[PDB]
Design a protein around this nucleic acid. Structure first.
Ligand SMILES: [Ca+2]
Ligand SMILES: [Ca+2]
Length: 220
DNA sequence: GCATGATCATGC
DNA sequence: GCATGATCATGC
C-alpha cells in the first residue's frame, strides 16, 4: 500500500488522475459528504489514503522514507488556484534559534507532490476530478523568494509586532489565522517582550506562487 | 470579484 | 492548544 520508491508513488498518483472523488471514495469505502463546508480537509485525506501516506497528526511528513510532502491544490476550469496553500503553523514564541535553512517551512516545501483537484463550488463534490501529479522542488528563485518572506515575517514575530502582522505582508508567502476560529488563542510576544495571548498564525502560499508552479509544469 | 480574516473536523 | 487536512464568506 505504501510506495517504496518515488517511481511507485508517481505511478500510483498517475493511476488516480482523472478519477472523480466519488469513484475513488467508493473504491476505498470512504463516505462522501454533500459539500466541503464541514469537511474541509476531506479531499486531502482522500488522497492520503489513496497514495498510502501517513494519516493523522504525524509530524510534518507524508512519506518520510521518501522525503516527500503531499498537497492537494484546488483549481478552477482555467487551471488557476482557487485557494491559498497552508504550509505550517508559525511559532510565535521561542522562535529564537531557527535559520531559513533549518525551518519547518523550508523542510515541508523542499519536496512536494502537488495533486491538483477540481475545486469549483458549483461542481457536486462527487463529480470533481483528480488531476495529474506534479512533483516539485523549489527553483533557486522560488527559494530566494520564500526565504525573503520567511525572514521578514519571522522578524516581526520575534520583535512583538504581532499586532502589525497582516496577511498583506509577504510577496509569495504570508501569515493568516490558523485555528478553530477568531477566539482561538496561543502564546506570543507583546509589544514589550512579555508573553501574551494572541491569535494563532500559519504560513500560506499565495495563489500567484502555486500558479507559477502549475505554469512552469505546463511549459514542460 | 476575490484576498483577508474566519472558520470546520479530528486526535490526543 | 497543537498539528494534521484545508475551504469558507464577509469586507472592500
Ligand atoms: Ca499527512
Ligand atoms: Ca501533506
Amino acid at each position: 500500500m505504501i510506495p517504496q520508491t518515488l517511481e511507485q508513488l508517481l505511478s500510483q498518483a498517475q493511476s488516480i488522475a482523472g478519477l472523480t472523488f466519488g469513484e475513488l471514495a467508493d473504491e476505498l469505502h470512504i463516505p462522501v459528504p454533500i459539500d466541503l463546508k464541514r469537511d474541509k480537509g476531506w479531499v486531502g485525506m482522500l488522497l492520503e489514503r489513496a497514495l498510502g501516506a501517513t494519516a493523522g497528526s504525524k509530524a510534518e511528513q507524508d512519506f518520510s522514507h521518501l522525503g516527500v510532502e503531499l498537497k492537494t491544490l484546488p483549481i478552477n476550469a482555467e487551471g488557476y488556484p482557487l485557494e491559498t496553500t497552508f504550509v505550517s503553523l508559525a511559532p510565535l514564541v521561542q522562535n529564537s534559534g531557527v535559520k531559513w535553512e533549518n525551518s519547518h517551512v523550508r523542510h515541508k516545501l523542499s519536496c512536494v507532490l502537488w495533486m491538483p483537484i477540481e475545486g469549483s463550488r458549483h461542481i457536486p463534490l462527487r463529480e470533481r476530478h483528480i488531476g495529474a501529479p506534479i512533483f516539485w522542488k523549489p527553483t533557486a528563485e522560488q527559494e530566494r523568494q520564500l526565504k525573503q518572506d520567511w525572514e521578514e515575517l519571522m522578524d516581526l514575530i520575534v520583535l512583538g509586532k504581532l499586532d502589525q502582522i497582516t496577511a498583506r505582508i509577504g510577496e509569495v508567502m504570508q501569515l493568516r489565522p490558523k485555528g478553530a476560529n477568531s477566539r482561538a488563542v496561543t502564546k506570543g510576544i507583546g509589544k514589550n517582550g512579555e508573553i501574551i495571548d494572541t491569535l494563532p498564525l500559519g504560513f500560506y502560499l499565495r495563489k500567484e506562487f502555486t500558479a507559477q508552479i502549475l505554469n512552469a509544469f505546463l511549459e514542460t
